[PDB]
């Protein structure tokens, strides 16, 4: 998907598809 | 940081790896 851009609760599912029940965190959004 | 990577830029899935815990 050449034109892919995720933002809030798109990037959160898109986190927990990717890292399954590992889990996941982001220490600052930029 | 993610939402500059993944949301004002386009970002690759593969680049959410980095995130797990």
Redesign the interface.
Same mark, same amino acid.
């Given at each position: 998907f050449v034109n892919q851009h995720l933002c809030g609760s798109d990037l959160v599912e898109a986190l927990y598809l990717v890292c399954g029940e590992r889990g996941f965190f982001y220490t600052k959004p930029t | 940081? *993610?939402?500059?990577q @993944? @949301?004002? $830029? *386009? @970002? $690759? &899935?593969y680049q &959410?790896?980095n995130? @797990?815990?």
């Open positions: - | 940081g *993610i939402v500059e @993944c @949301c004002t $830029s *386009i @970002c $690759s &899935l &959410l790896e995130y @797990c815990n």
